[PDB]
Amino acid sequence: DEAGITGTWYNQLGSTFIVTAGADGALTGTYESAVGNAESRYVLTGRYDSAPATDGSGTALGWTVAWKNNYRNAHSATTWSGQYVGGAEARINTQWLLTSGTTEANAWHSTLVGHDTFTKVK
Amino acid sequence: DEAGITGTWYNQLGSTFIVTAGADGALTGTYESAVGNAESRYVLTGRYDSAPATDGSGTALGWTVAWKNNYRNAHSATTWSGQYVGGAEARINTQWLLTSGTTEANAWHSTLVGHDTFTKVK
Amino acid sequence: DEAGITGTWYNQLGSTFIVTAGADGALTGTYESAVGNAESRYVLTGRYDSAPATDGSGTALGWTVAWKNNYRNAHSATTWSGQYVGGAEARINTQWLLTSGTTEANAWHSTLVGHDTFTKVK
Amino acid sequence: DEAGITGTWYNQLGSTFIVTAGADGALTGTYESAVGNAESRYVLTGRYDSAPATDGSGTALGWTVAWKNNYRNAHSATTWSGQYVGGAEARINTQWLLTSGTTEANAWHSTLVGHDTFTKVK
Ligand SMILES: [Rh+]
Ligand SMILES: [Rh+]
Ligand SMILES: [Rh+]
Ligand SMILES: [Rh+]
Numbered sequence: 001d002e003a004g005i006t007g008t009w010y011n012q013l014g015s016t017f018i019v020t021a022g023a024d025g026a027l028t029g030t031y032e033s034a035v036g037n038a039e040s041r042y043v044l045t046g047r048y049d050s051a052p053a054t055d056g057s058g059t060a061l062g063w064t065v066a067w068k069n070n071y072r073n074a075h076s077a078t079t080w081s082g083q084y085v086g087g088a089e090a091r092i093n094t095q096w097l098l099t100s101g102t103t104e105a106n107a108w109h110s111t112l113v114g115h116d117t118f119t120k121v122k
Numbered sequence: 123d124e125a126g127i128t129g130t131w132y133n134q135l136g137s138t139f140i141v142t143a144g145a146d147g148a149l150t151g152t153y154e155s156a157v158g159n160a161e162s163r164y165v166l167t168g169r170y171d172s173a174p175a176t177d178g179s180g181t182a183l184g185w186t187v188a189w190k191n192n193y194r195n196a197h198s199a200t201t202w203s204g205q206y207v208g209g210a211e212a213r214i215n216t217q218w219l220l221t222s223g224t225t226e227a228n229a230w231h232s233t234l235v236g237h238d239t240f241t242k243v244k
Numbered sequence: 245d246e247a248g249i250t251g252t253w254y255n256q257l258g259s260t261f262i263v264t265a266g267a268d269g270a271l272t273g274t275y276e277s278a279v280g281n282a283e284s285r286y287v288l289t290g291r292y293d294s295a296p297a298t299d300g301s302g303t304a305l306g307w308t309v310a311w312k313n314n315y316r317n318a319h320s321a322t323t324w325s326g327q328y329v330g331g332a333e334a335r336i337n338t339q340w341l342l343t344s345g346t347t348e349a350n351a352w353h354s355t356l357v358g359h360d361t362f363t364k365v366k
Numbered sequence: 367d368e369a370g371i372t373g374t375w376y377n378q379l380g381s382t383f384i385v386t387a388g389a390d391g392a393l394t395g396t397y398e399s400a401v402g403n404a405e406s407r408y409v410l411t412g413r414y415d416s417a418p419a420t421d422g423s424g425t426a427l428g429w430t431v432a433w434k435n436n437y438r439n440a441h442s443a444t445t446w447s448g449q450y451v452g453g454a455e456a457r458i459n460t461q462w463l464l465t466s467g468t469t470e471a472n473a474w475h476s477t478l479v480g481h482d483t484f485t486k487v488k
Contacts, residue, residue, distance in 0.1 A: 013474060024165075025165065025188050025190060026165075026167065027167075027186075035471075035474055035475075036474075036475070043146075043147065043148075043169065044169070045148065045149075045167040045168060045169060045186075046167060046168075046186040046201075047165065047166070047167060047186045047187060047188035047199060048188055048199065049188050049189070049190050049195065049197055049198070049199065049223060050188075050190065051190060051195055052197055052223055053197050053223060055225070056225045057197065057223040057224050057225055058223045058224060058225075058226075058229070058232075059223055060188060060189075060197055060198045060199040060221050060222060060223045061186075061188065061199050061221075062186035062187075062188070062199045062200065062201035062219075062221070063186055063201075064149075064167075064168040064169045064183075064184035064185055064186055064201065064203075065169060065184075066147050066169035066170055066171050066172075066182060066183065066184070067171070067182075068147060068171050068172065068173060073171065073173055075171055075174055075175050075179065075182055076171070076182045077169060077170065077171065077182040077183050077184045077203060078184065078203065079168075079184035079185075079186065079201035079202065079203040079219070080201065081186075081199060081200065081201040081218075081219035081220065081221045081233065082221050082232075082233075083221055083222075083223050083224065083229075083232065085226065093229065094221075095219055095221070095233055095357060095358070095359070096203075096219075097184075097201070097203035097217055097218075097219060097479065098203065099182050099183075099184070099203045099204050099205055099216075099217070100182060100205075101171060101174055101175060101179040101180045101181055101182045101205050102179050102180060102205065103177070103178045103179055103180075104180075104207065105401075107180070107205075107215065108379060108401055108402075108480050109401075109402070109478060109480075110180075110204075110205065110480075111203065111204075111217055111478060111479050111480060112475060112477060112478055112479070113339060113357070113463065113477050113478070113479035114339070114474055114476075114477060115339070115359045135352060157349075157352055157353075158352075158353070217479060217480070217481070219357065227279075230257060230279055230280075230358050231279075231280070231356060231358075232358075233356060233357050233358060234353060234355060234356055234357070235341065235355050235356070235357035235461060235479070236352055236354075236355060236461070237461070237481045268409075269409065269432050269434060270411065271411075271430075287390075287391065287413065288413070289392065289393075289411040289412060289413060289430075290411060290412075290430045290445075291409065291410070291411060291430045291431060291432035291443060292432055292443065293432050293433070293434050293439065293441055293442070293443065293467060294432075294434065295434060295439055296441055296467055297441050297467060299469070300469045300470075301441065301467040301468050301469055302467045302468060302469075302470075302473070302476075303467055304432060304433075304441055304442045304443040304465050304466060304467045305430075305432065305443050305465075306430035306432070306443045306444070306445035306463075306465070307430055307445075308393075308411075308412045308413045308427075308428035308429055308430060308445065308447075309413060310391050310413035310414055310415050310416075310426060310427065310428070311415070311426075312391060312415050312416065312417060317415065317417055319415055319418055319419050319423065319426055320415070320426045321413060321414065321415065321426040321427050321428045321447060322428070322447065323412075323428035323429075323430065323445035323446065323447040323463070324445065325430075325443060325444065325445040325462075325463035325464070325465045325477065326465050326477075327465055327466075327467050327468070327473075327476065329470065337473065338465075339463055339465075339477055340447075340463075341428075341445070341447035341461055341462075341463060342447070343426050343427075343428070343447045343448050343449055343460075343461075344426060344449075345415060345418055345419060345423040345424045345425055345426045345449050346423050346424060346449070347421070347422045347423055347424075348422075348424075348451065351424070351449075351459065354424075354449065355447065355448075355461055
């Protein structure tokens with residue numbers, strides 16, 4: 001699914017996910033969030049299953065963004081975990097965990113969870 | 123926290139997380155799971171905040187493993203999202219999302235969630 | 245939002261959520277899942293904020309179903325946590341955690357996570 | 367596990383979970399959080415598997431607290447999903463989702479996730 005995954009994706013928030021899928025299972029690229037303490041692109045890296053089943057199942061993958069770049073630092077990191085579904089209207093359906101650096105006393109409050117769906121159009 | 127993070131970590135399941143933290147915010151290394159459809163090491167990649175706050179807060183980070191290697195393929199990927207806490211007994215406290223590739227009809231059933239704590243000893 | 249919440253809702257899977265919102269903040273009713281090890285209705289109980297903000301924010305709520313009834317027992321329980329959004333096309337947007345009873349050795353594998361959106365029509 | 371579950375539990379934060387397990391699978395009681403926008407007891411309700419497997423597996427359960435009482439309203443609700451494990455040192459191991467009522471524009475930011483372990487002593 002190297003061809004399928006590689007390219008520019010957009011989620012329901014208007015965020016922009018630009019990713020290259022390597023033959024070796026690597027995901028590399030940049031993320032631009034439309035919301036939160038973020039601006040411009042952030043480096044991302046991740047992994048996908050480069051030899052998925054051939055039974056109609058999606059392709060498992062994930063990636064991470066640490067929310068620091070040359071412009072801003074939000075002292076947090078999000079990971080997206082999901083699968084790529086090919087075909088007519090390709091999608092990457094994910095759930096994500098956003099952890100902010102906290103003191104021990106506030107750690108119970110450290111992690112947001114949500115879900116993003118990415119498509120090739122937006 | 124480049125020095126702090128880099129090295130060998132172990133979680134409560136006996137899994138082994140071997141990671142190098144780069145000056146540029148990169149996480150690279152290998153993961154060996156003690157449970158599940160897995161054996162030997164898998165490539166991981168991720169990101170950490172390379173300029174965290176100086177107020178006692180932890181350092182945000184995350185990484186991804188796609189569960190394919192030269193031995194096995196589980197058609198799944200886990201992402202860990204959490205923070206590194208330095209000091210006397212350093213810890214990386216995470217929550218994780220494990221997504222398996224599924225058909226659309228089974229997608230509701232695609233994602234496990236849990237939490238792992240990593241320490242420098244085990 | 246007692247009036248708004250009370251009634252029959254349906255999610256994207258075709259499941260049926262029948263709920264009564266009490267003046268005291270109680271949620272009571274029945275759930276019928278369209279997927280998984282389930283058939284017919286299961287008792288649910290839960291809670292909602294009976295005095296929400298008046299600033300356009302949604303109404304926080306949650307409920308639990310244990311997957312045992314007179315027909316089947318799946319030895320599991322799901323909790324939905326989310327908010328009710330009123331207006332033209334009312335919605336209850338949730339994320340859920342489905343925990344299966346496991347042995348200690350399999351506990352890492354005990355919990356599924358996902359998201360369901362409920363509307364008054366389907 | 368009616369006998370096992372019923373009683374007073376405490377988590378790692380010092381919160382107090384007081385619960386009665388009914389023969390019909392009901393959970394009823396009160397929760398007192400040691401952290402966050404909360405004070406004194408809040409009503410809880412939930413469900414547990416009243417006929418669990420007899421193979422060493424834990425007992426699935428869940429409950430909800432809406433964070434409104436006679437003293438405070440935080441416009442939020444937490445659901446705990448997990449399992450009760452009996453024996454020498456009984457535990458209820460959970461993961462939780464805390465949803466705050468938000469505007470649509472802030473909904474991506476609505477839900478915290480974490481994990482609490484409850485024991486009979488603290
Ligand atoms: Rh969705
Ligand atoms: Rh923990
Ligand atoms: Rh959605
Ligand atoms: Rh734990």
